[PDB]
Amino acid sequence: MQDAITSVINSSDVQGKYLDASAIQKLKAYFATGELRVRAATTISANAANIVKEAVAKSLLYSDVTRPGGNMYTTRRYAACIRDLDYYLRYATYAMLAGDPSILDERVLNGLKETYNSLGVPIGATVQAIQAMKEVTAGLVGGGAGKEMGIYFDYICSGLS
């Protein structure tokens, strides 16, 4: 994975160039928001469980998905599902901390859609649950961090389409 710093280093390196003024502006921009990112990561971390619980309550509970025949039926599948949501939240936080979505492409999205399709995991419902976590999260980290987190929540959703 690349973070916002190493991302700038790599593009400079491919051109064989020392850090530019433009490259330096990007570095400084990430440094300025560093504390914001750490404070959001801290809250999310402390509310991870409640964030997932509320998102599920709001998007999956009491529907055909949880009833016999639904993909969330049986305690094993219910847990597998909340396990995935815990994943999306933890990885979205990583990407927000790094200021780069590469960890998502490499460790999350690679082969995910195919796997879901293979198992019959509904992508539309999964996407709705992530969008619900998006909203629950904004409300904890505030509008600022909330929109940043939203970029990465959407990135994942886009990769499932």
Partner: protein, 160 residues
């Protein structure tokens, strides 16, 4: 950087970063401007740093520039200085990242196999890095000199 490393570590343990890890990123970002400043000073003096380090190198190791030496000839000497420039560049990358990984991943892995194939005495390359370390840190303040010096030392140790 330490952001990537902390993330990779926390992920290996399927957990969120620890407060300790978070504090590390915290310091990392506040010292960002200092490090960027250090890197800028080195970038600006790039040409002068390579000329003087080059001169000091050929002074300590005339052989490489003499007949039968790997850098004998305007052109081979030029290419030798070109390599020194590649490394100064990597070092400024290292400084802004806060660690050696960029130096390591772009110019250290496989460095012994590459130079052995070209017949370049790697001990002389290290000497050239020692020279640059000297010219470069001389441009900095006591505090920054020590800080940037550590990146040079890493590289020197990886070639020895």
């Amino acid at each position: 950087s330490i952001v990537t490393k902390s993330i990779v570590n926390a992920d290996a343990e399927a957990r969120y970063l620890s407060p300790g890890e978070l504090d590390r990123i915290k310091s990392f970002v506040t010292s960002g401007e200092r490090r960027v400043r250090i890197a800028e000073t080195m970038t600006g003096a790039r040409e002068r740093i390579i000329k003087q380090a080059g001169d000091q190198l050929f002074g300590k190791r005339p052989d490489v520039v003499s007949p039968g030496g790997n850098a004998y000839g305007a052109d081979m000497t030029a290419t030798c200085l070109r390599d020194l420039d590649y490394y100064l560049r990597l070092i400024t990358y290292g400084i802004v990242a806060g660690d050696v990984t960029p130096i390591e991943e772009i110019g250290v892995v496989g460095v012994r196999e590459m130079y052995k194939s070209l017949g370049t005495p790697i001990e002389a390359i290290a000497e050239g890095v020692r020279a640059m370390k000297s010219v470069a840190t001389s441009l900095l303040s006591g505090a920054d000199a020590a800080e940037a010096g550590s990146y040079f030392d890493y590289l020197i140790g990886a070639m020895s």
